[PDB]
Amino acid sequence: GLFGAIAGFIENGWEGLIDGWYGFRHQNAQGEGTAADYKSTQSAIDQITGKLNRLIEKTNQQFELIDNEFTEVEKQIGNVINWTRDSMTEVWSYNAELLVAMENQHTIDLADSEMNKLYERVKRQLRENAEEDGTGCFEIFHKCDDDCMASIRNNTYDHSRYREEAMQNR
């Protein structure tokens, strides 16, 4: 996509993540752990949802028969009707091909975008207390236990607390 996270600096997706669209895996003294992020997952879901509610629509626009399957109408008017109907088929087939291609390009870039947002939101929380791996990973200098991890997810992680020790560990 445009933002370069999904099928980008992230190598690949996680078949193990079943609670959301985006999440975190960590490694620390106590072990490994995965968890879904509700906020990022919700924005994407709600937006894709909003798309569907616009498109899964049908008009209150009625049309009646202007020709006849049982007794053919006069040939000249018959051909003008067919020509017009075929002209409309062409227009709507184009519209529909484009609509869907345009929406899909955008849906994908929306997903790619929501990840990139989540990435950099965390980055900023950490400040000088961690560095950028490049594969979607944040290496932490100070050791960070499972309570310390849940505070990162919660957006309650206090960088100043662990700062001194992490900066000396540059």
Partner: protein
């Protein structure tokens, strides 16, 4: 020592298309083009009239098979292939226009023209049009000379529309199988039938001559019509060969008319109909039938157009 961000993925994704690419695999997607048809006319909650053997136009003139449809009332009108507008062989001039008027009519209400006659037969009949033996169009009168070969006296009949809506007036011209048959029914001489309104002007002549027998008759009745405006008059002046209306018709309101080959079903509701049935769908497009009518998804050529509802699928 570290924390890592990621996104979900699945084993089996679904392919979609984009501006830039064909066959991009995404986590989930959903169809925007309807392919599923219901092979019935879904008529739940609608006043329906399935004409069956009766042709739409026959509801106005009244051949035997339309005896139960002379004053119908409907939200949805269903024409069938086996339907026929006539008993005695013939045709409506401007026939499709009238059908379109009738399909959208909500049904019809009738009133007598109040035409009386004297010194003529009023009761012409045929075996082509049978109701326990020979009969005729139930709304029409076959006007004849009293006795064989007798001259048809030059008549003038008139009808004013006293109603607030327009009236539908019908008449017929009879074309005998031969000139000698024409003289037998309405006396000899070149017959003129005149018809006029404030909105409308026309005239007609019969055309006796050999035709192939249809319902065992080589004669023909041409039916004509006009829409008479509120508080306007129509005058019929005729030497003969003339099939007079017994009643005038009035439109009840609004309806939708369709043509179909499948059954009615009151268990199923739908607003998009075609000859093969009903398209029940929320989707914006459909690849089922380009002549579907009602409130339909738009017809498109593509069999499928998948709309992504998930991110790009990137498994290991």
């Amino acid at each position: 020592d570290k924390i890592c961000l990621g996104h979900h993925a699945v084993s089996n994704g679904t392919k979609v298309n984009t501006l830039t690419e064909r066959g991009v695999e995404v986590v989930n997607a959903t169809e925007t083009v309807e392919r599923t048809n219901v092979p019935r006319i879904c008529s739940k909650g609608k006043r329906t009239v399935d004409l069956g053997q009766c042709g739409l136009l026959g509801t106005i003139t009244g051949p035997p098979q339309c005896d139960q449809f002379l004053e119908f009332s409907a939200d949805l009108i269903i024409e069938r292939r086996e339907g026929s507008d006539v008993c005695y062989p013939g045709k409506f001039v401007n026939e499709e226009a009238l059908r379109q008027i009738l399909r959208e009519s909500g049904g019809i209400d009738k009133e007598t023209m109040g035409f009386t006659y004297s010194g003529i037969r009023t009761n012409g009949a045929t075996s082509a049009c049978r109701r326990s033996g020979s009969s005729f169009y139930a709304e029409m009168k076959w006007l004849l000379s009293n006795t064989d070969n007798a001259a048809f006296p030059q008549m003038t009949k008139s009808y004013k529309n006293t109603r607030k809506d327009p009236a539908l007036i019908i008449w017929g011209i009879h074309h005998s199988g031969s000139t000698t048959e024409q003289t037998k029914l309405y006396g000899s001489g070149n017959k003129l039938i005149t018809v006029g309104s404030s909105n409308y002007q026309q005239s007609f002549v019969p055309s006796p001559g050999a035709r192939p027998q249809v319902n065992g008759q080589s004669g023909r009745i041409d039916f004509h019509w006009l829409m008479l405006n509120p508080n306007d008059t129509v005058t019929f002046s005729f030497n003969g060969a003339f099939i007079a209306p017994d009643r005038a018709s009035f439109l009840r309101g609004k309806s939708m008319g369709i043509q179909s080959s499948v059954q009615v079903d009151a268990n199923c509701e739908g607003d998009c109909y075609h000859s093969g049935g009903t398209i029940i769908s929320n989707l914006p497009f459909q690849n089922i039938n380009s002549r579907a009518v009602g409130k339909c998804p738009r017809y498109v050529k593509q069999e499928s157009l998948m709309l992504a509802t998930g991110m790009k699928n990137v498994p290991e």
